[PDB]
Amino acid sequence: MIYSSDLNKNLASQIIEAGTPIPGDDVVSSLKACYQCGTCTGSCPSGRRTSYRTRKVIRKALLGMDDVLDSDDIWKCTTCYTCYERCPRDVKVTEIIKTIRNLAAQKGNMAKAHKMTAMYVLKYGHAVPANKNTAELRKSIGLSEKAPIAQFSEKDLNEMNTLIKELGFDELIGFDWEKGALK
């Protein structure tokens, strides 16, 4: 039983504005073109082994079901772009999912593992940073012990930290700069 009181008329409009200006108003507004054909769900590799149904995410978005932001299902999409490539209505599905995930992150629905990945980029400038084993391996292969990457450049690490603070990404993930860890 879904009553008008359990629905949010503005969900589609709120998803569209979160997507403005990146990836774009025209990109995310494409969800309004969806005619629930199912081509996206049928093309979904994740959907073949889970309860995840791409078409329902878009339906929930249009109907006004805010639970779609609290769902674990939107996080099962790998961004393979198959649905994006096959949609006969030009819905930029993959981009709409990513945008819905931005609103999910802002509501506090972000996984600890993801926050950790994001913490590594903030801390070392890289999601998969170099180790003691990296240096030893690179040495034995004939490559420079430390790659010319942000991990070993304070200028670049500081540049990133300034942009992260300006974008409020640190607050989004819940990172404490003095403790150097997530809250």
Binding site for ligand SF4 (CB under 6 A): 34-40, 43-46, 54-55, 58, 77-83, 87, 89, 91, 93-94, 97
Rule CB under 8 A: is residue 137 a binding residue for another protein?
A: yes
Question: Minimum CB separation from another protein for residue 179, in Å?
Answer: 21
Binding residues for another protein restricted to 149-178, rule: CB under 8 A: 149-151, 153, 155-156, 159-160, 162-164, 166-167, 169, 172-173
Torsion sign over Cα 107, 109, 112, 118: negative
Binding residues for its own copies restricted to 36-55, rule: CB under 8 A: 48-49
Rule CB under 8 A: is residue 181 a binding residue for another protein?
A: no
| Long-range contacts from 76-79, C-beta under 8 angstroms, 24+ separation | 76/46, 76/50, 76/52, 77/44, 77/46, 77/52, 78/45, 78/46
User: Cα separation of 181 and 178, whole Å?
Assistant: 8
Binding residues for another protein restricted to 83-122, rule: CB under 8 A: 84-90, 94, 97-99, 101-102, 105, 110-111, 113-114, 117-118, 121
Q: Max Cα separation, the chain?
A: 66
List the one residue out of 110, 94, 95 whose CA is nearest residue 175.
110
Rule CB under 8 A: is residue 1 a binding residue for its own copies?
A: yes
Per the DSSP assignment, residues forming a β-bridge with 181 are 176
Binding residues for another protein restricted to 38-77, rule: CB under 8 A: 38-50, 53, 55-56, 59-60, 62-63, 75-77
Q: Phi and psi dihedrals of 176, rounded to 5?
A: -105, 120
Summarize as ranges the residues that interact with its own copies (CB under 8 A): 1, 48-49
